[PDB]
Symmetry: none
Subunit: 469 residues, 4 copies
């Protein structure tokens, strides 16, 4: 019955955060300030990766692939041994298995996966596709596995395919894809084609300069991106290209004026440990040597330049980092995780309420059938129909998110990705722009995660085996 | 509003389980079938460990310790470097830090713990006290740290105490405690003193034979215990010592008649991997037969048990009190603390209500405020009352708070429960209230954006 | 004082073998019957691999590499973590470490390698370059590591190099090489360029038809090659292209007539386990359906077609196979290991006797300096000069084999490759043709491997701590 | 012809070692410093194990067993599936197979062993009896298999014996033997009976204090034993019990004065990894002090020893009787069998000579023969004499042959020696005959093409 802001404006709270204590707002650029348009940006990365793979010898049918945003979900595991995409829970239990576009059923999942379980720490065999840049790669791996499996020129093996005399393991194929994505991002034409048509590929919104200017009135604001200065300058200039400043009627000002500290070539995640040598960019040439642009460095250096403490820093961005080093080197930043998928997922939550409602009433009906039964009862009520309907309606709900289900769950089970969100992120939202709807004095209060004995037991007011006498 | 059984009869569901698919019910003995009375049994283990430590050289003031059930909560981490008991969350963030009986404030925690965080994988430094047998040792560690800290004969250091020329690190003190507890269980008088006063130390309840007999009508039932046969026979004979069988009026039956397979000397968790040689016990002498109904096994493996029972993993519901790692039986986890924690949940409702009211008031004070707002409403009072009422709530569980949470955050132990257990309850005896055709359906653990958004725009968010 | 055949004719005996019991002589083709000319064949494989790598984006300086037979030795370990070539002993102790062409000294070896030791079973990090086809690949890995390390366009890291924005790990580079060698052998122009100039690339000798015909008079003879029929037919026709048959004056006969059983597409090593489906080749088209050519199959099938027992079979070839399956499925063949390097190594053994002799007399001099000393003595004779001379003369000897030393040893220590020879091979020689110099009744008697307490104690005729009373 | 010390004083060299670089000499105690008398000590361990097995139910005819030193050779593999003792080479090829006391011929070996080969990595099936303590158990396994095979009360099966209703697998019989040996060493009377008649069971020799005192003049000396302090004190006091010190005329000194560091309760091999907490012993009570020259340590790690000694790995020569795996100290391996094996090598020379003559004659009979030859000379006689004389040679070592070889092939144990040991000898006491400036230079292990080709063509071989 408490007041809550409209859902699509909310910032969600994993751990409590008193915003009045925040003195510095730090930002990633890609997919945080620079939100890339979907599906256009993924298709561009898809198309460039396919072209690079064809350029190194992959067959011409790759050019008939077309990126399909309805297939990939972030956080899938590619098993390089069997060429499968796996959606797993926090502990490695298998929730979904797809070989190419063929979704593997419960029983035959066991043939390849004993106990429907993988050792997700075996980074030699399993690659976790966690990032927004990974999305085209996820769809591509399925396309290739699908193409080779059904093309007669190839004989399918359990761990790969035979191209004439050549055996190509799925692991070797995966490394070709991984290398080709990297090439496209770092040597290929991806940045050039993005920059030459910013309107098609990058979101633009006047709420961004407005929010960042309000942040700079209460604290310091900094940028730490892995991109180089040239690419950063093009992107940020575009993001702030309006015929006014923070508010309508005010003069436009340069994007740089919004930041107390600008840092490019960050080399994250190494940035958060030792980092690299702190350099400084010549703004004119964009080559190396307020108003200063830094290069490389470390999070510790940034902390000292801004005269701040880790807990005073709210770091806003799209990447999930690991717990490494946080038990030794002090000063850990607070974190805001941008999760774009939340916008569509919140729509499913409200626009598909019919599915959720029926699942609830099916569970209510079940409880009624067993209301009067205990271990003394030999009645075995028929629930096979109810069970079938629950499986079907749960499958419909999953499919409302796409072919690989919700980012956060699969049926009743939370995903590995969801558990990483709850580890990593103090706050999270579809976009950082939702901070616009909260004052900078706000106390963000953590939402409780109830366990079964809490969510199903009212506060409303015995065998000694339970009580230990 | 869906029908649910009375709270104290409930079996709670982490993952869905169709009971009609279960063909074998397996049991641990200790703290599952044989529920040890509390605080009596911990007090006995405490006293025997303290006496064992005195006999190897610890000072006489240990004899003045008395076990105090209100202090320890299961699942605490003992840091052998700094001598602290730590309550931590699923990821290693510190929730509580006690040096002896001194509870440490947030800021001073950071002095020893950068980022209020520990690497729980550092097995050489941190020992996790997860088991019910661990409760006396948990209290004992605090008493010792308290005693030596405040005794003039000793000089407190960061990593231990100086006894003149001698230095006793918390790591060495810990090893003494750990060996002493092992000795009491394996060589000392704990089993003997338990067995010679069963009424004081072990719960007895006629529901147990009743439930086990009903399980045997629908499938197979087995025992797999680490205890030896002599101890097991004594305990099980007591648990089944009634002047009738499963129901009043029926003849009493020996405990062995309730099990299709009885295995002692299991050596769990090794049991769940390679195991050891499958042996058989001479029930008359309690010793192993040289060669291999009526039969008692010893050693073996979980694989061998499945072959003898004609079962597959998913067909087996393994009922017990220990959490195992996952390096495939269904699992029922017995968690006896739940009985008192469910009472706090229903008898201390008014604390919960007030926290919700304070939260509702906070939302009201920021209702009309956004990033353009300059108001900073005074919330210091409200913040102070929230902190005080959350601490009152924690203290309702004991000095180290709830097994499953600290203030708002879930514990490492809670996250282990959610990983390991398909089903859980204060006792397996709650299965008596469910038919064997029951479909247990998982209770969802909601994420913030699910539990705070009803089922009833900037392109930065929608990606256009 | 016993009679021995001339060294370059010898067959060397690891385990005794009564040749009168052998009923079947089996053969590999590549580098056994078809001995490829050196260094020409390696250079061709080198050149094709470099061209394939340049074709997938590697820089143009690769075209200025030239294969150098004096660098690689067979059996080196490529450490994909640090980009080093490692020569190790039977147990993983490091004997030689080269980063590119930079040979790493004793002390700095320890920085990267604790205890001068590697876990050689870690097949994810360490790749063993065991085969004759591997030789060009071994030299290529050193060239590339050398090129990138000293080319200014690249920044060297510990685990790879930076090409602008792109980081290329040595492991990713290794996989590019491994893939490119495979492509060249199985899809590229290697076989075509070999077949179009057989005189330049394949050894030809009339002793081969003569020996195989004498083998067929006492037993059965079979061929089991991984090559396909078309390539096999071209190669074998060339090997038997003389204007006479086994002896001068006799009519020429087709290569096939020398074999009771011919098997192509063997898919070794899988051949020695379950194998593949036994197929039969249409000789005319060379496509699939005495005088019969088989395809695929298994060693067990071959054993049954020839009506033989494993111990009755002497399998002659150039590859070393593992112990897998030999504790379960019975019928293990006897083995003759062709080791071409033996021809040059036997030359060093006799033509460098001067180096061996001085090492011996330096060891004799050492023994004299300590002749009259025991634990009661405090004299510490100066041996620093002797020690320096032993290190230098041992280095000279090693270099007589090439930059990476002998195939079989490094100083006093036997190599991993030598220990695999002594595990795998009953007999071994520079070529199987040395069987020509032995009758088929010969008893091959194993040469003893003396331990130190045997080789340094004469048979020529005490504290109870030693005798246990 | 180079100068070499007398054979029975030699220290043999697997890898070169500059003794002047050695700064610390570390010692095992059992079977290194304390050499147990043979056959007396094995006979005692045998008798105590047999009595322990009888007490748990094994038949009375075990009491008629007598230990026989001429049967067992160290390093044999017990196959718990088929109940065989196997002597194998470095790669798992079978050299010898004994079922009980029945030695199995080549062909019948293939029935049970495809390719005359075992997977020595199959730890669940094969147990390798590598240690000197293992000798009594090796003979005991054969006696038991012999007894049950030939006793009418039992039915021999492939994998064990039937005792009416009972089946005793070799695997279970093996486990009984293994536990019985452990019990005798750790709970039974073996240590007590050793210590109460030291003269019968332990070698004593004045060279030991002499050598150790010379080592301490050039570097540090330490003891690291798995035995406890009470046992160690008794044994070491005996080893140093002479009415003088290192040399005649000098005052006797306590054994502890010979060591810069004394460590008991080492728990090797765990010692070489993480180890346990470094503790200190109260030399008066023999118990651990609660806190931590004159000092005796307990537990700890190899890393901790190196810090206390100010040493690095390569600076340490570790002298002892056990072979450890390599999952960096220099090593001296004590191998007491060498004393008798060196006697066979020099007193049985005439067998060696004759084998060489038969080999020389064979080479003469094939001298003028090549692949064109049709002669098949009769070698069946010569072959038979070779086989007979090689068997006579093997038998000079005992029924299971040499520790290091079988006929012509090297043993698995020999290949472990070459891997693990930089230096080796019958006893470390042979170090007395070498100055501490000595440079030990490896003796080469030659391959066939090296040892049969003096230092004094087809393009198929030369590759053109």
């Amino acid at each position: 019955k408490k007041y809550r802001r409209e859902a699509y404006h909310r910032v969600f709270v994993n751990r409590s955060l008193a915003m009045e204590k925040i003195k510095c707002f730090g930002f990633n650029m890609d997919y945080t300030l620079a939100v890339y348009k979907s599906p256009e940006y993924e298709s561009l990365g898809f198309e460039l990766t396919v072209e690079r793979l064809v350029s190194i010898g992959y067959p011409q049918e790759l050019l008939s692939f077309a990126y399909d945003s309805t297939f990939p979900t972030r956080g899938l595991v590619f098993d390089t041994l069997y060429g499968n995409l796996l959606k797993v829970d926090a502990y490695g239990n298998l929730l979904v298995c797809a070989h190419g576009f063929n979704f593997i059923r419960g029983p035959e999942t066991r043939e390849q996966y004993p106990n429907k379980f993988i050792q997700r720490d075996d980074t030699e065999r399993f690659y976790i596709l966690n990032t927004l840049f990974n999305l085209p790669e996820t769809y591509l791996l399925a396309c290739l596995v699908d193409f080779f499996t059904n093309c007669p020129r190839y004989t399918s093996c359990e761990t790969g395919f035979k191209d004439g005399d050549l055996f190509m393991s799925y692991r070797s194929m995966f490394q070709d894809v991984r290398d080709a994505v990297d090439w496209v991002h770092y040597k290929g034409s991806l940045k050039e084609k993005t920059v030459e048509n910013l309107e098609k590929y990058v979101v633009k919104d006047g709420k961004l300069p407005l929010l960042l200017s309000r942040m700079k009135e209460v604290g310091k604001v900094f940028l730490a991106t892995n991109s180089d200065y040239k690419y950063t300058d093009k992107i940020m200039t575009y993001l702030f290209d309006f015929p006014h400043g923070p508010k309508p009627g005010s003069s436009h000002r340069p994007w740089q004026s919004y930041f107390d500290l600008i840092l490019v070539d960050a080399r994250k995640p190494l940035f958060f440990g030792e980092g690299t040598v702190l350099r400084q960019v010549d703004t004119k040439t964009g080559k190396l040597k307020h108003g200063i642009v830094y290069s490389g460095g470390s999070s510790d250096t940034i902390c000292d330049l801004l005269g701040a403490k880790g807990k005073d820093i709210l770091y806003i961005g799209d990447h999930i980092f690991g717990d490494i080093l946080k038990s030794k080197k002090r000063q850990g930043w607070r974190t805001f995780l941008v999760i774009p998928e939340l916008a569509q997922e919140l729509h499913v939550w409200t626009d598909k309420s019919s599915l959720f409602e029926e699942l609830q009433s099916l569970d209510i009906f079940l409880a009624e059938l067993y209301k009067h039964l205990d271990s003394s009862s030999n009645e075995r009520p028929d629930i096979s129909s109810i069970q079938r309907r629950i499986k079907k309606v749960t499958h419909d709900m999953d499919m409302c998110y796409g072919m690989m289900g919700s980012l956060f769950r699969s049926g009743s089970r939370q995903t590995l990705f969801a558990s990483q969100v709850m580890r990593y992120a103090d706050l999270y939202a579809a976009s950082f722009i939702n901070l616009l709807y909260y004052p900078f004095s706000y106390l963000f209060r953590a939402a409780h995660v109830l366990m079964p004995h809490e969510s199903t037991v009212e506060h409303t007011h015995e065998s000694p085996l339970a009580t230990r006498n």
